[PDB]
Amino acid sequence: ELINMRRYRNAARKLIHHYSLNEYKISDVVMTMIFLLRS
Amino acid sequence: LINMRRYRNAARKLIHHYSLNSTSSTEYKISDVVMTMIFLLRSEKYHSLFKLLETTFDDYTCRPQMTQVQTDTLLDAVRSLLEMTIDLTTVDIMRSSFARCFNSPIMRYAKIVLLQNVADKRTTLEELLIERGEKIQMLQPQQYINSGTEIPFCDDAEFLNRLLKHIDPYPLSRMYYNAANTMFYTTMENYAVSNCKFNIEDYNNIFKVMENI
Amino acid sequence: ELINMRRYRNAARKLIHHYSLNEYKISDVVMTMIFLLRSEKYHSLFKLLETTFDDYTCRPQMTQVQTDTLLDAVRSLLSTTIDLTTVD
């Protein structure tokens, strides 16, 4: 392991779910893309 | 899959801008920082820089404590990335600026920031100047130019004209901007690393003096 | 016993939960931190807090299993769920 991909996946989910339903940071989107790559 | 060429170029340009060595100002998108991060994640020699970027994803408040072998490996990696000088304070500038960007929220409007979080105790410029003078007085000179040495003015007016027409195609204003930005960069970084408060107000007052004349 | 860990545990749980919500005393903080130093399972949070001193420093990358262990250790101290943002 090189990353706690739990935080990354949770940030990813929160961001995408927000964008689908309708408060985040560019930190958050880079975190999201990091998880996505990990997935 | 990621285009090594495009991701490489984005990472290089981003590190150039955040290093302040790039007086050139260009737009940075969320795509660009994502591009650089992805290159970091793909480049094994720069996976050290990738973990450093992750440490900036953290509270970015430590002074990352790396042994000297890791320090020099990191310097080699950043040198092979930027392809220029890049040194330790440049690395800590990377850390501070990129951690601040990380912190930054997404925003359709660009922003402007000023460096800090680089080299422990805020030092007032007053005592800083005092101590500087205390050393300098003890720093005895090592060179000298006695007499009012004649200025070696070049009487070769043909040389003057040749070099003039050589510099004539140069867009003077472009260089005005390059030089002024470079001076601001050096002064700001020095105030930050010296950890002395930067007085942008009197920096502008320097200009103001310059135009009042 | 050198020190009754029960009072320290009560103070620790109360402090962490209250801060999760958002009268106490600095000695209460001493008790909470002493339990934290005495409870091997929570010694992970012990390192986390001891690092937070000086600068806020940083929280070193924490494996999946480790983070699961810490969140379980917190949940035993409380039950409702938790996450990393509460820890932050």
Next chain:
Amino acid sequence: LINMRRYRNAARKLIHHYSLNSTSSTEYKISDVVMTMIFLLRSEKYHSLFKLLETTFDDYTCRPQMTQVQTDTLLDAVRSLLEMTIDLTTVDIMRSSFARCFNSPIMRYAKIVLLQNVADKRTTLEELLIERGEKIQMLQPQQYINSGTEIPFCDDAEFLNRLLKHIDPYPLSRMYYNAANTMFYTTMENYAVSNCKFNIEDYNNIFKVMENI
């Protein structure tokens, strides 16, 4: 795992500060107190002092029971920690200050206070002076001097100026701060231990006189 030496330094600075034996004035934080008490704990040879610290958590108005040999142990521990004299009333001052820290909850400022509740009956100064004088006359004086003993001013300007230049680098202002605060701390602790009212107003009146003269 923590920096044993760093916590040792914090403990030493904190105890030297609250002991008022160090004129140096430095602020401390809850980080400092947790750090110092952790050092006190881990130090096997300071378990007794750590247990006194633990007892201070209560109302700390008790003078703890301790046998003379245990007193020897704790005085050895404090002498080792401070690496200096110091005596029991200093230990009472330790408990008073540390515990009066404990009783305070979290607040956004560092409160300044004055020692009290150290050594029973609430005392004033007039009967204190009377009893002191009668006790002096009770005891016998030790030394006697006679003759109009000449003031032995050292005539030779050589060593006069030698000692002068020896003291000339000294930053007098620090001398003033140290000595004045030493007067203040000893007066306050002597009044607190005696339970006599430490008249801060009279100390400030001594100041006022000094400016006016």
Next chain:
Amino acid sequence: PIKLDLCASVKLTPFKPMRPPKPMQCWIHPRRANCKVTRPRNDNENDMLHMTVLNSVFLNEHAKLYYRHLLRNDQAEARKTILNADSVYECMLIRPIRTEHFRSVDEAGEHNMSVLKIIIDAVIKYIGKLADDEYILIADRMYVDLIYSEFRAIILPQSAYIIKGDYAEDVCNELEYPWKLITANNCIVSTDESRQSQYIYRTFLLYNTVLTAILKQNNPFDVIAENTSISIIVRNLGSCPNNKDRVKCCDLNYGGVPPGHVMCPPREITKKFFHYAKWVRNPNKYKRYSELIARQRDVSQLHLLDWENFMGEFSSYFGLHAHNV
């Protein structure tokens, strides 16, 4: 309705020098009659201008409409005062970009916490331009009106009042050398408790503005009506189930996800504050309510502290600090 000291004391018809707009409405504030929207007939796709009708009472001694005293680096493109007899008119020119529009603080219910961050930053620096010994009162509501696009926030004209204190250790005379011997600015006995009342007053104003920002239902805490006492308001609403010292704000219809207990302030602090703020009706008789907030005894200070805790946790809810206090 005008008379004179003249023996006849003739009736003087109050002629109004200007011509106020006839269509006195504002789609930004449809209910607010005094709000007159006027999209200037011209990024210019969204150019803007709006006139607010106020009473000249909010004018100062130097003919300046009070709230304007804390506007610096005024992002608003244009702004100035006008008077038509008692009535007055503040017109503000603005022009967002094509993809930018400004929206009324009313019933905002905005879920974008960072937009709220920028709004609160604007208002907090605004009130920070206040002077410590100077106390302020607002006569329209328990908040400040403001309009805002995601990119930037622009204050609205306000029912603002500027009363200067005087802390007896700057003297209250400012009208120049010869004028002062005739009269001087009316100070009040500024004291630490009244000043902390003023700090917490700004803080409560900020809190109420944030509520209006996060509500889809009219914010009753902003009301000042005589007929509605804050006591009965707390009574009919209640205390937060998550904490009895707070109010039952957690259950309100927030625009976004309910912050719940987070938006529940302590009750009696807010009651003491509502009755501190009703001072506005009579600003002149200051001592009634000058330090009512910080007035006393032990219950007073301890609940002042738990309000400090609530406002501190509010600030940290976005990484803010109580330096404003």
Next chain:
Amino acid sequence: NKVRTVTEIVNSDEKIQKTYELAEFDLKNLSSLESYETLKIKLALSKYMAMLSTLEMTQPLLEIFRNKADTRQIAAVVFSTLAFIHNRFHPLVTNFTNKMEFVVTETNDTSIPGEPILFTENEGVLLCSVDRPSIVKMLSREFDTEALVNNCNVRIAKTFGADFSITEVEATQYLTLLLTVEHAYLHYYIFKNYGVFEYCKSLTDHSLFTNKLRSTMSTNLLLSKFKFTIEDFDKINS
């Protein structure tokens, strides 16, 4: 404020005005005055050190007063201190009265707070009670020889315009004992000038010192150099 000064040659109307800033000259005057003050005080300190060394001490002062036995040298040091005070206050009389006694107090129930050292006549001659315990504890204290103590602009401008072993801590302790004897000798002046009753009244209330010494001191004190206060009265006395 500012001093306009005219350079005029009457042969023509030509005048070349040149205003001068009084602030620079005031700062020079000040700087010279404090340098002279520091000079005089450090000369007094060095002279006191030299006369002490003419007493031929072996130990440093802290170990000197550490000794529990030899009250002879403690008393000699006390006499030397008080005689020096009486000297540079009243140089015409560079010698204290002929006879005196000494009692060395060793415990707190005999150590009086505020004025650990004191005089009191035996009805034949003044004698001194000396608080070796507390004074020695005072000496063994650490002193802030490592941290600087401090208008900014004036300070910065002046800064830019700028084998016996003794340490800065030794000089700190010497200043400390010197000011203690300053205070004690002022009390003793109250004694010998206004009676034992007024001696006690000055001991209890030192505001009387200004009144009493307006007759003598004005026509001096080393401690008058700096301005002294106790920290944080705003929220201490609150």
